[PDB]
């Protein structure tokens, strides 16, 4: 009941709050699973289980070099489009070293937007604590001279203070 | 009604072996995992494990490792716990919980995961004195 | 690290609201639900909320949920006679891989 549809190498697997979101850049394709797996000893996978673990195998040993390394079991993921993942993490080690599949990508739209603008967004955060940080520094100093006015200028209001 | 119905008080000298039964009601037995937790008298609460009613399968906290037989009676709709080699801290109320997390989905059977304990039983004091 | 922590007891008065928290870490409360179950002391727990902040049915409408990040929170209103009973947040744990409850905040009220 199970055919191979496509392998994909580099797939990144993000825990959200409910699913696991299986992001993939080669088929630009994101597949959300519920966060329980499939049962890998059961019934229904006797006739695909094999093969997906020769071709994980395979790709371990052919597309990743020396650096890295399994990590994890073949874990089975059923997603929420009915189909079937095997996902087999891998680490880098260390001191050593439906028909219609466009909700796939929409996913895949979504989780490279909403992280980017997550992560630009943020680095504008820091930088703008950083200059913050550095300003208040300048009041300071600026403060011994005309201290009226800085006080105006951070208050917003006219505000009367001597040194 | 959708309730578990657990057994009476009971009494064991350490060093025995005391079983608890929980049986289901208004809902398949075979399709949700069921949590056992214990709490002590005067403490919070305390997980010991999940059961897979379905499958047979069932995982408990290292403390309970080894010390726990799990059976299941499907014509009665039955799950049975029996704890071994007491001592004097397992005197506590044991509840069984169903879980919201099914044993099989549409088509494949489902590894654990916590999604709530939705369902309580009435709880079984049990007692380790000399 | 992989621990929860709620406060030991809460207080308060009729017709107030009471809240609860709930502090966890980067996993369990960071990245997966939070379920909040009240025990009247002698009976059996029951499930209070089943998710962030869904309700379950029955329940009645004075208990909220809330999620912050590593916090969730659960407010009572109206806070009647019956409402005084313990109150546990649990949370699944990927490092453990195992659910983890709280300690218990009992309401005096």
């Known amino acids: 009941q199970l055919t191979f549809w496509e392998a994909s190498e580099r797939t990144i697997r993000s825990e959200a709050e409910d699913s696991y979101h299986f992001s993939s850049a080669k088929m630009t394709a994101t597949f959300l699973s519920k966060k329980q797996e499939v049962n890998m000893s059961d019934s229904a996978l006797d006739c695909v289980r094999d093969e997906a673990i020769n071709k994980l195998q395979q790709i371990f040993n052919t597309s990743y070099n020396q650096t890295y390394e399994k990590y994890g079991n073949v874990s089975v993921f059923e997603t929420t489009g009915g189909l079937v993942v095997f996902w087999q993490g891998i680490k880098q080690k260390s001191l050593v070293e439906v028909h219609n599949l466009v909700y796939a990508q929409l996913q895949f739209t979504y989780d490279t937007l909403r992280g980017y603008i997550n992560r630009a967004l943020a680095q504008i955060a820091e930088a703008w604590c950083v200059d913050q940080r550095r300003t208040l520094e300048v009041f300071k100093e600026l403060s011994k001279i005309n201290p009226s006015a800085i006080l105006s200028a951070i208050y917003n209001k006219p505000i009367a203070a001597r040194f | 009604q959708v309730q578990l119905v657990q057994s009476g008080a009971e009494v064991k000298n350490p060093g025995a072996s005391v079983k608890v039964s929980c049986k289901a009601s208004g809902y398949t037995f075979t399709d949700y995992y069921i949590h056992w937790v214990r709490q002590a008298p005067g403490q919070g609460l305390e997980w010991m494990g999940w059961?897979?009613?379905?499958?047979?399968?069932?995982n408990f906290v290292q403390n309970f490792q080894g010390r726990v037989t799990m059976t299941r009676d499907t014509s009665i709709s039955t799950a049975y716990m029996e704890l071994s080699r007491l001592r004097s801290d397992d005197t506590a109320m044991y509840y069984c919980a169903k879980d919201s997390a099914k044993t099989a989905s549409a088509y494949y059977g489902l590894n654990f995961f916590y999604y709530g304990m939705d369902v309580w039983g009435q709880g079984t004091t049990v007692t380790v004195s000399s | 690290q992989s621990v929860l922590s709620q406060p030991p007891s809460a207080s308060g008065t009729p017709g107030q609201r009471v809240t609860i928290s709930c502090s966890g870490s980067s996993s369990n409360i960071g990245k997966n639900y939070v379920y909040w179950y009240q025990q009247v002391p002698g009976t059996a727990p029951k499930l209070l909320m089943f998710?962030?902040?869904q309700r379950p049915s029955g329940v009645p409408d004075r208990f909220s949920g809330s999620k912050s990040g590593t916090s969730a929170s659960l407010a009572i209103s109206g806070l009647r006679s019956e409402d005084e009973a313990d109150y546990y947040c649990?949370?699944?744990?990927?490092?453990?891989?195992?659910?983890?409850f709280g300690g218990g905040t009992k309401v005096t009220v």
């Open positions: 649990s949370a699944w744990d990927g490092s453990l891989s195992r659910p983890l």
């Open positions: 998710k962030n902040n």
């Open positions: 059961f897979n009613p379905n499958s047979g399968g069932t």
